[PDB]
Amino acid sequence: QDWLTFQKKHITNTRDVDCDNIMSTNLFHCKDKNTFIYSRPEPVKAICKGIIASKNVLTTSEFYLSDCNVTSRPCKYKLKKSTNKFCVTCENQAPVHFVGVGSC
Secondary structure (H helix, E strand, O other): HHHHHHHHHEEEOOOOHHHHOOOOOOOOOOOOOEEEEEHHHHHHHHHHOOOOOOOOOOOOOOOOEEEEEOOOOOOOOOEEEEEEEEEEEEEEOEEEEEEEEOOO
């Protein structure tokens, strides 16, 4: 919804995200999937450099991603690691919404 919240939801300083803990918090409410980006925040903000009006933008480089994907047991997850580009909505030169993996 905004860059402060995007960071909390989508930027990780570990590839080994503690899915079963974090996905259960009020930030996610045990939803099916969330993509975490293993990166410092500056390179991630910089995806949106010079993009002011709301626009979906695909990363120029691949990143290390960790997906928490729900198992058959509600709020219990598998961590799926991938290396890929991803797309975000840029508003006011910052990511405010995670669009998808691989493309916009």
